[PDB]
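Amino Acid Chain and Its Fold in Token Form
===========================================
What this section holds: a protein sequence and its matching fold, both as plain text.
Structure line: whole-number tokens from a learned vocabulary of local backbone shapes, matched to residues.
Purpose: to set a sequence beside its fold so the mapping can be learned.
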Amino acid sequence: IFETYMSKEDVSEGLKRGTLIQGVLRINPKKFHEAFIPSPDGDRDIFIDGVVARNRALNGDLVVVRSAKVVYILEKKHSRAATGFLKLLYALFSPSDHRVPRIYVPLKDCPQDFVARPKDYANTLFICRIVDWKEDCNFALGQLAKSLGQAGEIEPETEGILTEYGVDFSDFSSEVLECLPQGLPWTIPPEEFSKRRDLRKDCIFTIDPSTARDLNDALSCKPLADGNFKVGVHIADVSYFVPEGSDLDKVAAERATSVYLVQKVVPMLPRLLCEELCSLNPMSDKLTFSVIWTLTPEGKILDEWFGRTIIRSCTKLSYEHAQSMIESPTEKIPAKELPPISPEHSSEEVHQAVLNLHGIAKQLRQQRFVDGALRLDQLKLAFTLDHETGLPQGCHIYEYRESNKLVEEFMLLANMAVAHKIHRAFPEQALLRRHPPPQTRMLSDLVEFCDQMGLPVDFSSAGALNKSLTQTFGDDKYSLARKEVLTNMCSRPMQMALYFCSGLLQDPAQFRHYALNVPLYTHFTSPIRRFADVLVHRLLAAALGYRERLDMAPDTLQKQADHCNDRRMASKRVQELSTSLFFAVLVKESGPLESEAMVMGILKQAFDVLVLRYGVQKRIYCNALALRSHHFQKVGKKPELTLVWEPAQQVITIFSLVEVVLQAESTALKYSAILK
């Protein structure tokens, strides 16, 4: 039995006075009896003990409240749905996630076969929605939605996590497709040859991954007569095809971002706009919102010009061909291994252009990292799948080659220029991004860990952290894995970047983006994938005088920014769970996997390893080992584990190389790591 809520008047009086604290509660996934809310001042996170003192609040909900109890909930931000197995002791519903409680389902809603034949529905996934939670029941009451399929397959589990996080994957209604342009061979109206600059004769190319349906940007470089370069970044304008107030705009605001999975993509726009009308496919006249600079070979801006233009791309490179033409500076690459090119242009022009853009991008990278920019890069693996069955065949870690940096530098230049322009035009309504500095309290724990063990790292500033992480060790077989484990330890106290409106924050200290070490930043180069990009596009168009001033209030922009923030968070969590699902299926269908590992932590009966080939973090317990004995020691707050397997002995401490094997178990989506 819980305790009843407080009325609105008391909550308003308490909040205005300052006796009550609002926050977004975070629940530990591994232990569900404890919860945490952030302090307003910036002190240690306020602890919430018990399950009773959470008082029917779920993870992600914002509440109004040293150990404390939750007494009021303003906004319910959780989706209130879960994927679980159906059992008996009404009927009981058990979710896979342990933060959602256990749910009662009425026996009228259950299928007829289930009451007669319970066993045959013992490995089937069901989706249930919580509708009400009583004051006298420890279990919520729910409604059964549908039958997903067999547990452990690919499509039932994918649709289960998409519905559990709230991503709307349903098809577009016809009132959305009625706002699209009509006519199958759409062409540019002849009235746009006067409001736009004609760039159809220049050399324009795109560099995006080979498996990319939609293209958001194009690049160009032209050498001048005094040793300078004219460098242009051209973005497909989705604000021409998305009018304000139409049902297309309401749907695109409803889903802030598009979600990328292992096997498919859940889009933001209709497929016509995402693939044919707006994406910069080669050999077609397209409308773009370009930025054009004149740069020195050292990467210094001498001119800047914004404006609407018309382009015609000549080729579509990938991240694989671009490295070939970078790594062949003085040798003609044969045309057999190149994508098709428009007949007006030659492969020499494109080949020369990639070299010049790489030459500028190297010096821009060096100058940005002298200025203090920080880069914490973890491991991102990519799969190779079966075309017909749809099961994964094999994984390999993605490789961040030079061509992935050549594009990234120019996207940063375009974003910084657009941020300056739209902030200097409208100071009271502008959408910008911000990265706070990391929290000092839980940076201090990393300070006290790394001050020992003879490791000279410092967390005073971002540039200091980057130079410390790079100079101390490199170019050794153990040192690269050492770099990976230190990066994984360092990436934990960092905060997440936020969208915000410039008319509500008062002081100019908050605006600066910490990790890039710049005072102003925004998102302008990906309209098809995000909706904040479309808002920035409209604001920039209003600033240059192409249209009238936005008729949107500065508080509605804050509400829209909060919605885009929560949607981005849900998108990142969904991609993480999809990658984990496909890796578990690969381990089950490819036998035991052998690799090496480094110990990242030690405990009395367990220790954490990091598998070097795959980058996952499993846990290894001494109960599963075939050992005679084990002893735990600590000296100078340094853990040590001694294993007795005349038998031999092994000593394992932090940053020790072991050999591990991954083996699937009888459960559908589980595996285990065992020492070899």
Notes: Residues 554-588 form the longest helix (35 residues). The first strand starts at residue 22 and ends at 24.
